[PDB]
Amino acid sequence: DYEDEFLRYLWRDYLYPKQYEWVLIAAYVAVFVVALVGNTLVCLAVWRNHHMRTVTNYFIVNLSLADVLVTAICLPASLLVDITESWLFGHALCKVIPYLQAVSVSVAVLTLSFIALDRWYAICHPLLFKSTARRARGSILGIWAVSLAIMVPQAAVMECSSVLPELANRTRLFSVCDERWADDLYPKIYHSCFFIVTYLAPLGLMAMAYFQIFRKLWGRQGIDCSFWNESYLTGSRDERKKSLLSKFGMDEGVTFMFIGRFDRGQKGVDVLLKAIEILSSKKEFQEMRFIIIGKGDPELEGWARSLEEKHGNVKVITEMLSREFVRELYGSVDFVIIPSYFEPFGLVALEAMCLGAIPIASAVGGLRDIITNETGILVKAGDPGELANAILKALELSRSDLSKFRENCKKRAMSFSKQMRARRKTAKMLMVVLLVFALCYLPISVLNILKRVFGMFRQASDREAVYACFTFSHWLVYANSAANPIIYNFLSGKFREQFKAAF
Numbered sequence: 001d002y003e004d005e006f007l008r009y010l011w012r013d014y015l016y017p018k019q020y021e022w023v024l025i026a027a028y029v030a031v032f033v034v035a036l037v038g039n040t041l042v043c044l045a046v047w048r049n050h051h052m053r054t055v056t057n058y059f060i061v062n063l064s065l066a067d068v069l070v071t072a073i074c075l076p077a078s079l080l081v082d083i084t085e086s087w088l089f090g091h092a093l094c095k096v097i098p099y100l101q102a103v104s105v106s107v108a109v110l111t112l113s114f115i116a117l118d119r120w121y122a123i124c125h126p127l128l129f130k131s132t133a134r135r136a137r138g139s140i141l142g143i144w145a146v147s148l149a150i151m152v153p154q155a156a157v158m159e160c161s162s163v164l165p166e167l168a169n170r171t172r173l174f175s176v177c178d179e180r181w182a183d184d185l186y187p188k189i190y191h192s193c194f195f196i197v198t199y200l201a202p203l204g205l206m207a208m209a210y211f212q213i214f215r216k217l218w219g220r221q222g223i224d225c226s227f228w229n230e231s232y233l234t235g236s237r238d239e240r241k242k243s244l245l246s247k248f249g250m251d252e253g254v255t256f257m258f259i260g261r262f263d264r265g266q267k268g269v270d271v272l273l274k275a276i277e278i279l280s281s282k283k284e285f286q287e288m289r290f291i292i293i294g295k296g297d298p299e300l301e302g303w304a305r306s307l308e309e310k311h312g313n314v315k316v317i318t319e320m321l322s323r324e325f326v327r328e329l330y331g332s333v334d335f336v337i338i339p340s341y342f343e344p345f346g347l348v349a350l351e352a353m354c355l356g357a358i359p360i361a362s363a364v365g366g367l368r369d370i371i372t373n374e375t376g377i378l379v380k381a382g383d384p385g386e387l388a389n390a391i392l393k394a395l396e397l398s399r400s401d402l403s404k405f406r407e408n409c410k411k412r413a414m415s416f417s418k419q420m421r422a423r424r425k426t427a428k429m430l431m432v433v434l435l436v437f438a439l440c441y442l443p444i445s446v447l448n449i450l451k452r453v454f455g456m457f458r459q460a461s462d463r464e465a466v467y468a469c470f471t472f473s474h475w476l477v478y479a480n481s482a483a484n485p486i487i488y489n490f491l492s493g494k495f496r497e498q499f500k501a502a503f
């Protein structure tokens with residue numbers, strides 16, 4: 001009958017001294033200061049400098065401000081509650097602080113989502129990529145609006161109660177803050193939807209987005225620009241060409257060069273050979289030199305050697321060469337032909353371009369991205385005829401200086417390589433941030449979903465370790481706020497620079 005009543009009456013002053021408290025305090029103040037100075041350093045770094053004012057960094061600022069909010073208001077309250085098992089604040093703050101916590105979690109997740117979306121467009125759909133500062137500073141406002149709108153039920157249900165309800169004796173030592181619902185459907189529904197909205201759906205979506213992003217960035221680390229440059233070549237280019245041609249027993253002429261596996265339906269050496277057969281006539285053919293380098297199918301090798309013994313301006317190399325010598329080739333020949341069928345990386349285009357070799361390549365895959373206007377010739381893949389015509393145009397261009405074209409090739413290759421490297425680094429950082437986020441909010445979510453929907457931890461002496469789980473989960477949640485600036489400091493060069501300069 002009056003068991004809970006009487007037991008509460010007897011044990012109401014039984015404080016149980018927790019063995020590990022000073023470590024919790026130390027952890028909380030550590031996280032507190034680190035999150036504060038870290039996130040403020042983020043905000044300062046971005047706001048002050050102009051090169052930092054990027055959409056990604058505007059969002060990162062939004063995230064940092066969210067974390068600042070949480071760290072300032074909710075972290076100390078969470079510390080006090082978790083240590084003293086009591087609510088030491090007003091009835092108003094009992095609604096406000098958990099509300100601000102929910103809202104800020106929302107803001108954080110949505111921010112990461114917009115980061116992921118922005119990067120997903122920039123990388124996976126470059127053509128549709130629209131991302132001005134006006135969009136960001138206006139989308140952030142939408143994030144805060146929705147976040148401040150959909151969290152009002154939690155503010156509503158937050159109540160500050162103490163002694164067991166329906167009890168005449170309102171005597172108490174301490175009060176506590178918790179949720180008060182009517183129908184038991186309401187808390188289950190709201191908390192399941194809270195887990196879904198603030199964790200499940202956006203982290204799923206972002207998992208997809210970063211999956212596609214990393215799939216698009218995979219294997220694209222760029223090339224060694226320190227190796228692939230003309231600096232290690234001696235003399236003038238035309239004299240290197242003259243030396244090269246005379247070394248193969250040929251005379252001066254507009255030199256084209258293929259390098260790749262002799263494949264049927266990949267590197268397209270067959271397209272090249274066919275194109276040479278097309279060029280076997282015409283007046284222009286004698287003005288051309290061809291150097292076909294590679295090794296693959298015996299049929300294609302024979303097909304090449306036949307041309308090497310038919311036309312005096314065609315040399316075939318099935319010999320194994322060194323990178324230094326390949327470099328020397330790229331810095332000697334006039335044009336390099338990449339008749340690929342689906343070339344996803346086009347490292348030959350980059351490596352050759354860095355050495356002034358002008359690319360004549362099939363408009364497929366990576367090549368399309370690398371070779372733009374005023375920096376190469378692009379061909380419908382597969383068609384030997386259009387390739388031959390491209391070679392003819394190359395010849396008609398060779399009756400001019402071509403030097404600025406080559407310098408354009410160099411610049412394009414270098415900027416492209418640097419861009420893909422920067423891209424890689426950025427995506428890596430954002431990935432790590434998302435990951436650390438997920439791991440940080442995982443325990444509190446598994447606990448909340450196990451406490452508010454699928455039963456609870458309310459029965460008997462099944463509470464002592466559960467409190468410890470909850471305190472740890474809370475601390476972790478706040479530790480994320482300290483984590484992000486550190487992540488930025490290890491994985492973003494510009495943030496490193498600004499974090500150093502701030503001292």
Ligand SMILES: Cc1ccc(-n2nccn2)c(C(=O)N2CCN(c3nc4cc(Cl)ccc4o3)CC[C@H]2C)c1
Nearest residue numbers: 074077078081097098101102105444445448474477
């Ligand atoms: C302390 C803390 C930290 C993070 C939390 N989180 N889990 C998921 C998202 N974020 C929670 C938590 O379990 N939340 C979020 C909001 N809630 C809440 N209660 C709080 C009490 C204090 Cl002292 C300070 C902040 C508080 O936020 C009550 C509802 C419930 C869903 C609690």
